[PDB]
Scaffold this motif. Structure first.
Motif, PDB file in Angstrom:
ATOM      1  N   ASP A   5      60.507  20.943  30.098  1.00 45.49           N
ATOM      2  CA  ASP A   5      60.573  20.950  28.632  1.00 45.49           C
ATOM      3  C   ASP A   5      60.967  22.303  28.068  1.00 45.49           C
ATOM      4  OD1 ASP A   5      60.018  18.266  28.536  1.00 45.49           O
ATOM      5  OD2 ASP A   5      57.916  18.516  27.970  1.00 45.49           O
ATOM      6  N   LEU A   6      60.417  23.370  28.640  1.00 42.13           N
ATOM      7  CA  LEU A   6      60.826  24.743  28.291  1.00 42.13           C
ATOM      8  C   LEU A   6      62.265  25.007  28.605  1.00 42.13           C
ATOM      9  CD1 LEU A   6      60.268  27.649  27.351  1.00 42.13           C
ATOM     10  CD2 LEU A   6      59.072  28.035  29.491  1.00 42.13           C
ATOM     11  N   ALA A   9      64.469  22.969  26.360  1.00 43.49           N
ATOM     12  CA  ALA A   9      64.425  23.483  25.006  1.00 43.49           C
ATOM     13  C   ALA A   9      65.247  24.756  24.851  1.00 43.49           C
ATOM     14  CB  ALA A   9      62.992  23.728  24.579  1.00 43.49           C
ATOM     15  N   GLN A  10      65.200  25.644  25.839  1.00 44.42           N
ATOM     16  CA  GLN A  10      65.951  26.891  25.759  1.00 44.42           C
ATOM     17  C   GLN A  10      67.433  26.647  25.769  1.00 44.42           C
ATOM     18  OE1 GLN A  10      64.071  28.885  29.031  1.00 44.42           O
ATOM     19  NE2 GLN A  10      62.779  30.121  27.678  1.00 44.42           N
ATOM     20  N   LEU A  12      68.952  23.853  24.834  1.00 44.94           N
ATOM     21  CA  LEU A  12      69.277  23.189  23.573  1.00 44.94           C
ATOM     22  C   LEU A  12      69.360  24.095  22.317  1.00 44.94           C
ATOM     23  CD1 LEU A  12      67.253  19.839  23.962  1.00 44.94           C
ATOM     24  CD2 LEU A  12      69.655  20.264  24.475  1.00 44.94           C
ATOM     25  N   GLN A  13      68.461  25.074  22.262  1.00 46.80           N
ATOM     26  CA  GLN A  13      68.407  26.054  21.189  1.00 46.80           C
ATOM     27  C   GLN A  13      69.679  26.851  21.224  1.00 46.80           C
ATOM     28  OE1 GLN A  13      65.874  26.483  18.693  1.00 46.80           O
ATOM     29  NE2 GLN A  13      67.967  27.029  18.192  1.00 46.80           N
ATOM     30  N   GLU A  16      72.560  24.940  20.060  1.00 47.08           N
ATOM     31  CA  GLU A  16      72.471  24.994  18.598  1.00 47.08           C
ATOM     32  C   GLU A  16      73.026  26.297  18.042  1.00 47.08           C
ATOM     33  OE1 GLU A  16      71.771  22.624  16.471  1.00 47.08           O
ATOM     34  OE2 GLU A  16      70.813  21.166  17.782  1.00 47.08           O
ATOM     35  N   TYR A  17      72.748  27.388  18.743  1.00 50.32           N
ATOM     36  CA  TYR A  17      73.217  28.696  18.341  1.00 50.32           C
ATOM     37  C   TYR A  17      74.724  28.950  18.552  1.00 50.32           C
ATOM     38  CZ  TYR A  17      68.391  30.110  17.146  1.00 50.32           C
ATOM     39  OH  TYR A  17      67.159  30.182  16.512  1.00 50.32           O
TER      40      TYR A  17
ATOM     41  N   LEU B   8      60.565  28.771  20.666  1.00 43.70           N
ATOM     42  CA  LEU B   8      61.227  29.573  21.672  1.00 43.70           C
ATOM     43  C   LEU B   8      61.081  31.068  21.413  1.00 43.70           C
ATOM     44  CD1 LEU B   8      64.105  27.084  22.226  1.00 43.70           C
ATOM     45  CD2 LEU B   8      62.237  27.638  23.790  1.00 43.70           C
ATOM     46  N   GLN B  40      65.785  20.268  10.303  1.00 39.84           N
ATOM     47  CA  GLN B  40      66.194  21.289  11.261  1.00 39.84           C
ATOM     48  C   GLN B  40      65.335  21.328  12.530  1.00 39.84           C
ATOM     49  OE1 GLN B  40      67.613  25.124   9.915  1.00 39.84           O
ATOM     50  NE2 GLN B  40      68.649  24.248   8.125  1.00 39.84           N
ATOM     51  N   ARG B  42      63.967  19.783  16.107  1.00 40.62           N
ATOM     52  CA  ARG B  42      64.098  18.885  17.248  1.00 40.62           C
ATOM     53  C   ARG B  42      62.878  19.130  18.107  1.00 40.62           C
ATOM     54  NH1 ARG B  42      69.855  19.818  19.957  1.00 40.62           N
ATOM     55  NH2 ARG B  42      69.218  17.859  20.951  1.00 40.62           N
ATOM     56  N   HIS B  68      57.761  21.238  22.527  1.00 46.04           N
ATOM     57  CA  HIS B  68      58.652  22.389  22.325  1.00 46.04           C
ATOM     58  C   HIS B  68      59.551  22.104  21.143  1.00 46.04           C
ATOM     59  CE1 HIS B  68      57.221  23.424  26.384  1.00 46.04           C
ATOM     60  NE2 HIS B  68      57.613  24.653  26.101  1.00 46.04           N
ATOM     61  N   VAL B  70      62.910  22.970  18.965  1.00 47.07           N
ATOM     62  CA  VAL B  70      64.248  23.554  18.919  1.00 47.07           C
ATOM     63  C   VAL B  70      64.737  23.496  17.470  1.00 47.07           C
ATOM     64  CG1 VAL B  70      66.630  23.352  19.741  1.00 47.07           C
ATOM     65  CG2 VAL B  70      64.716  22.808  21.287  1.00 47.07           C
ATOM     66  N   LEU B  71      65.261  24.612  16.985  1.00 43.91           N
ATOM     67  CA  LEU B  71      65.749  24.714  15.618  1.00 43.91           C
ATOM     68  C   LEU B  71      67.257  24.581  15.553  1.00 43.91           C
ATOM     69  CD1 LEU B  71      63.548  27.659  14.285  1.00 43.91           C
ATOM     70  CD2 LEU B  71      63.153  25.208  14.180  1.00 43.91           C
ATOM     71  N   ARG B  72      67.741  23.712  14.662  1.00 44.60           N
ATOM     72  CA  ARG B  72      69.161  23.673  14.304  1.00 44.60           C
ATOM     73  C   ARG B  72      69.467  24.842  13.400  1.00 44.60           C
ATOM     74  NH1 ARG B  72      67.419  17.795  13.867  1.00 44.60           N
ATOM     75  NH2 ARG B  72      68.784  16.694  15.350  1.00 44.60           N
ATOM     76  N   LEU B  73      70.719  25.317  13.415  1.00 40.90           N
ATOM     77  CA  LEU B  73      71.186  26.157  12.333  1.00 40.90           C
ATOM     78  C   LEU B  73      71.195  25.343  11.033  1.00 40.90           C
ATOM     79  CD1 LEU B  73      74.100  28.229  13.956  1.00 40.90           C
ATOM     80  CD2 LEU B  73      71.942  29.127  13.095  1.00 40.90           C
TER      81      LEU B  73
ATOM     82  N   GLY C  47      66.764  30.494  13.385  1.00 41.87           N
ATOM     83  CA  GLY C  47      67.609  29.411  12.891  1.00 41.87           C
ATOM     84  C   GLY C  47      68.576  29.770  11.770  1.00 41.87           C
ATOM     85  N   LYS C  48      68.683  31.059  11.448  1.00 38.84           N
ATOM     86  CA  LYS C  48      69.575  31.557  10.388  1.00 38.84           C
ATOM     87  C   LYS C  48      70.576  32.557  10.936  1.00 38.84           C
ATOM     88  CE  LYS C  48      65.603  32.794   8.725  1.00 38.84           C
ATOM     89  NZ  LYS C  48      64.486  31.796   8.727  1.00 38.84           N
TER      90      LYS C  48
END
Lengths: 19, 73, 76
Positions: A5-6, A9-10, A12-13, A16-17, B8, B40, B42, B68, B70-73, C47-48
């Protein structure tokens, strides 16, 4: 599921970035 | 019951929830502590992204489980 | 104060910065350690996407925060 999950999640983040 | 949400950035968020709470309720409770809008967020648990219309009980999320975030922009 | 900048490849850059530093200043400090020009650097926190005009204080970036650095190609 241990660290699944960690590490998921990393990744996926990070996806997203890249957006 | 207590559950934990890990961001995270290393932060643990503690929420008071019930098994009948929907994922939307959980996201709204995260918004109350952190200010993050539900759209935003997940949430990840047991290899799955959790879906809005389901409950904690549906995913077998029990006391002291860790989600956990996770953030969207 | 100390902050950390993490690339998407897992590499961590440590910087010395002040709350009044602008994002652009932070990018120039990344350039001093890595050689990456500010114009190819995109910084993210919580997230920004951070804007060059604003300061670390404006974004509530405090000691030992982690920023995320995304690199972009040069147009020309």
């Amino acid at each position: 599921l241990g660290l699944t999950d960690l590490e998921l999640a990393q990744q996926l983040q990070q996806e997203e970035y890249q957006q | 019951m207590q559950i934990f949400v890990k961001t995270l950035t290393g932060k643990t968020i503690t929420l008071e929830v019930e098994p009948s709470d929907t994922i939307e309720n959980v996201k709204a409770k995260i918004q109350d502590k952190e200010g993050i809008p539900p759209d935003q967020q997940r949430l990840i648990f047991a290899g799955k992204q959790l879906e809005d219309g389901r409950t904690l009980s549906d995913y077998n999320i029990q006391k002291e489980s860790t989600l956990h975030l996770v953030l969207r922009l």
